[PDB]
């Protein structure tokens, strides 16, 4: 009854003691002697225009030249970023697209949003006519993020406080990861794609695994909703960016926050987090319309991107670190290098 | 090589025709949000002007994240059932929609639903309106208020008091960026007239004529 909540309180108190027992130094304390990072001048190389409403998600191909971008007009444009040429423009059934994904093979593209269905599109179908390969229904709220593991598996976070591992060839939920008490706003697959982290509106992140299905770890520390989450490129850390206007670096084995990228003048929440190839730059889109580039170790903002006329909804760095595309609510994708 | 770039550029050209043709359809339609399987588009067309309203059903009761998708709708349709106090439950939701950062340019068309229900409530002796709003006990129906017939001054009291609550939230902030249009539930003509009025005020604001 009520004393069961007391025993859970003592258990999480034991967790708090076991996590401050393994904390005697910081990430900032070890990094007082490392080299700084200069003012990161990134000029907008390409400006992909061609979306009619606010771009809510973009995603890079794994060859790092094709990027899909979903906007709220109902359109899913695959761009060649090297030439600013549109490769495809898939019209979508529902116009409210809160997420997009590109398959790592490059054949499929997911989308999803307030329609509660993940639509999987084949790009290389027979000769090129982008039709819907699979509509994955089974979620009870809006889809917030979707990330392909294989061509055959996807994982979709939803606003029904639940992530879900699907099977594209069959169309049904292989695994259902429950445990969040708020809308799961994002997810990020590991470089090994065995685990994935998922932050929600209850200010908590959770580390899962697609094999078993139970929650491996839980990360508190944020004050409000986690709008964005991304993995450090080794799979051992991840940066969460929330609506309390902080980013935080949580490590899995350390099981707690290593660094907190905040500022006094910064008051609005981080819409998107992304890392560089080295993990030395944590780029973070904002609702003050500019992506600050945080030195991940030193926690002082190296650069600012600052080209967007509206809220930087989406922000994605390439696989090879060669460029960084920021889409925004002004319907323009900017490629920074 | 140069030939595949030519093929890619002709594909870009044939995609830009469809995006040009889709911009014409997208700028013509008015997106609404009915805020009385996870979304129910209902396209309707009055006076050849295309609307498509979005009734967000099969969503959770926690709206602080999917309401930002609807920051670029022309209007939020806010159907409030004038009777847990579920009138203050809509007063507070209007208070948070009005003062939200992204819906701060998005106007609200406010439908004060169920006025016949309120009439048979207030004349029968089930006046909870004085118990849940004691500021109604000192209220006086304004001189710029129409008691259209079938109305004694006990239902046009509570009715205009309830829109005065919402216009007390609405006129605190948001002077020129967005507007609340209160109505008492022909119902589609009011949405059309107020969307014409939203679009006109947006255009008059883009010229600094308002």
């Amino acid at each position: 009854l009520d004393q069961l909540r007391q025993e859970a309180e003592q258990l999480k108190n034991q967790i708090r003691d076991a996590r401050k027992a393994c904390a005697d130094a910081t990430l900032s304390q070890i990094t007082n002697n490392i080299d700084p990072v200069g003012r990161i001048q990134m000029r907008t190389r390409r400006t992909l225009r061609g979306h009619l409403a606010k771009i809510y998600a973009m995603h890079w191909g794994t060859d790092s030249r094709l990027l899909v971008s979903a906007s709220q007009d109902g359109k899913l444009i695959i761009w060649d970023s090297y030439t600013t040429n549109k490769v495809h423009a898939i019209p979508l059934r529902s116009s409210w697209v809160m997420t997009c994904a590109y398959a790592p093979s490059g054949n499929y593209v997911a989308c999803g949003g307030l329609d509660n269905i993940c639509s999987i599109y084949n790009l290389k179908t027979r000769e090129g006519n982008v039709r819907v390969s699979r509509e994955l229904a089974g979620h009870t709220g809006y889809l917030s993020c979707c990330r392909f593991l294989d061509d055959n598996q996807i994982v979709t976070s939803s606003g029904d406080t639940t992530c879900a591992l699907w099977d594209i060839e069959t169309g049904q939920q292989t695994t259902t990861f429950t445990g969040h008490t708020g809308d799961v706003m994002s997810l990020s697959l590991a470089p090994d794609t065995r685990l994935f982290v998922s932050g929600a509106c209850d200010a908590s992140a959770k580390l899962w695994d697609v094999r078993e299905g139970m929650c491996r770890q839980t990360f508190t520390g944020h004050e409000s909703d986690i709008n964005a989450i991304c993995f450090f490129p080794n799979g051992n850390a991840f940066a969460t960016g929330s609506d309390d206007a902080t980013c935080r670096l949580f490590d899995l084995r350390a099981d707690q926050e290593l660094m907190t990228y905040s500022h006094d003048n910064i008051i609005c929440g981080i819409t998107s987090v992304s890392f560089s190839k080295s993990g030395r730059l944590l780029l973070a889109g904002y609702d003050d319309f500019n992506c600050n580039v945080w030195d991940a170790l030193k926690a002082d903002r190296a650069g600012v991107l600052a080209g967007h006329d509206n809220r930087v909804s989406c922000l994605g760095v390439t696989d090879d670190g060669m460029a960084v595309a920021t889409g925004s609510w002004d319907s323009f994708l900017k490629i920074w290098n | 090589q140069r030939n595949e770039e030519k093929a890619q550029r002709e594909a870009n050209k044939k995609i830009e025709k469809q995006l040009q043709k889709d911009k014409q359809v997208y700028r013509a339609t008015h997106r609404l949000l009915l805020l009385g399987s996870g979304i129910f588009e209902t396209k309707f067309q009055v006076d050849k002007v295309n609307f498509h309203m979005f009734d967000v059903g099969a969503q959770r009761d926690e709206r602080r994240k999917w309401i930002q998708c609807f920051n670029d709708v022309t209007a939020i349709i806010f159907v409030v059932a004038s009777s847990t106090n579920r009138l203050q439950a809509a007063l507070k939701l209007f208070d948070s929609i009005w003062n939200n950062k992204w819906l701060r340019d998005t106007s609200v068309i406010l439908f004060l639903n169920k006025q016949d229900l309120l009439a048979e409530k207030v004349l029968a002796g089930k006046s909870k309106i004085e118990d849940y709003f004691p500021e109604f006990a000192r209220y006086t129906t304004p001189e710029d208020a129409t008691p259209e017939p079938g109305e004694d001054p006990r239902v046009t009291r509570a009715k205009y008091f309830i829109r005065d609550e919402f216009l007390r939230i609405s006129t605190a902030s948001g002077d020129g960026r967005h507007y609340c249009y209160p109505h008492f539930t022909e119902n589609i003509r009011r949405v059309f007239n107020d969307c014409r009025d939203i679009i006109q005020r947006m255009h008059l604001r883009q010229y600094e004529l308002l």
Partner: nanobody
Amino acid sequence: QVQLQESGGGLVQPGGSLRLSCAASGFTFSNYKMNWVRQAPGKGLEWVSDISQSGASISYTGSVKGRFTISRDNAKNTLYLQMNSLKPEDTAVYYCARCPAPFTRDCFDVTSTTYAYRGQGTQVTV
């Protein structure tokens, strides 16, 4: 972890007084608009009274207007609901909520069924 620890709720006859307090840890208390959400025995979640970051923007339901008086003390990370002249329609579980974002005039989903930043609630019984 955002922790809302309500306290001070007991039993009293109609016309009495109680002083609720929600001890709030895990977040900077001054940046958030707080709230008081009561839940009746027979109904859902009724908002009662909010107070903004400073403590000068105070609103109430009319069911508690003139009778209850909230105040926050930002230094001790506390939020009070002084209760006076209680009615049998005021017996409820009083959750002390906290709108999610900082520095925002909007206050969403506070009375929702599964809101995150809401406490466990003092049962106030008359």
